Design a protein around this ligand. Structure first.
Ligand SMILES: [Zn+2]
Ligand SMILES: [Zn+2]
Ligand SMILES: [Zn+2]
Length: 306
């Protein structure tokens, strides 16, 4: 009869992540018969994700979100999760995490080394490519000034598919696109909406190049000290929330394709075989850099059938 718990996130109060985190809190409060109350700290009120992960380890924050690829910070091979074309769809991302030796061991490491218990995994959208001219096939990527965040995997995507990667302040993007200083960008659909890139981009291509998940993480210092019945309430709620979280993305993506088209955007579905094939030299550079541990992770994840 009473645990006052804290759930920190990067995501804002208008996000799907936030909405699912509210579902989780409400469920935990109801099913705990009011014994557990979870307060939400959106928009990095408590720090960035690195800082919030550290708070989970030390026990000063109870819950947070992270994506599986973010653990590349501790184990370089965990970058496998955001390698372009490695994770074909969300099913692959789930089997990668929970149904490979690599994934299982990563989960154990989060527990033992990082003090974190992985309660559930949700889908957080797939990255797509908008542009000012149609992407009918990989040929059209040549010469495309493609804005990417300053992240190695996104730069590799732009590079190896033949585009000209163009790192730029996120604020500057809308007007760069409007004046054709940049030809396209690469982001999930939620972001195209949020930034109204549909106003300044009349083409979107389902390039499905990088898939994002989100993990419901709890501090060991909190979770392992809860009564077994409250542990179950927390775990059950996280699983329920993750399934909701997934559906918000899956549905939102479909809704948004339709709305974008309403706004004049034309959608294409280009053949991704050559897109994936072009990544092989970056995969080689991934294995070179992350060693036998990263060769192993890749082989385990191919053979997952999508
Ligand atoms: Zn209290
Ligand atoms: Zn093992
Ligand atoms: Zn379609």
């Amino acid at each position: 009869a009473d645990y006052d718990l804290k759930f920190g996130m990067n995501a804002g109060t208008s996000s799907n992540e936030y909405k699912a985190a509210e579902m989780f809190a409400k469920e935990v409060k109801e099913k705990s018969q009011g014994k557990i109350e979870i307060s939400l700290y959106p928009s990095s009120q408590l720090g960035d994700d690195r800082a919030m992960l550290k708070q989970l380890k030390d026990g000063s924050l109870d819950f947070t979100f992270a994506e599986s690829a973010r653990f590349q910070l501790f184990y370089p091979e965990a970058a496998v999760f955001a390698l372009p074309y490695v994770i074909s769809n969300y099913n692959v991302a789930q089997k990668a995490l929970f149904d490979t030796e690599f994934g299982k061991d990563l989960i154990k490491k989060m527990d033992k080394d990082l003090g974190v218990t992985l309660l559930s995994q949700a889908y957080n959208g797939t990255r797509q490519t908008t542009s000012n001219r149609a992407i009918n096939s990989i040929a059209d990527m040549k010469g495309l000034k493609l804005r990417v965040p300053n992240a190695a995997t996104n730069l590799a995507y732009a590079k190896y598919v033949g585009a000209s990667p163009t790192p730029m302040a996120f604020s500057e993007v809308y007007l760069a696109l409007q004046t054709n200083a940049v030809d396209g960008q690469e982001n999930p659909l939620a972001a195209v909406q949020a930034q109204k890139f549909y106003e300044v981009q009349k083409f979107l291509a389902m390039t499905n190049h990088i898939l994002n998940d989100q993990l419901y993480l709890v501090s060991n210092e909190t979770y392992k000290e809860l009564p077994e019945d409250l542990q179950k309430v927390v775990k059950d709620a996280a699983e329920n929330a993750a399934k909701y979280h997934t559906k918000l993305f899956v549905d939102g993506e479909k809704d948004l394709v339709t709305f974008f088209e309403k706004q004049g955007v034309k959608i294409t579905h280009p053949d991704l075989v050559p897109f994936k094939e072009s990544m092989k030299p970056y995969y080689a550079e991934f294995v070179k850099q992350t060693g036998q541990k990263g060769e192993s992770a890749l082989k385990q994840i191919e053979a997952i059938n999508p």
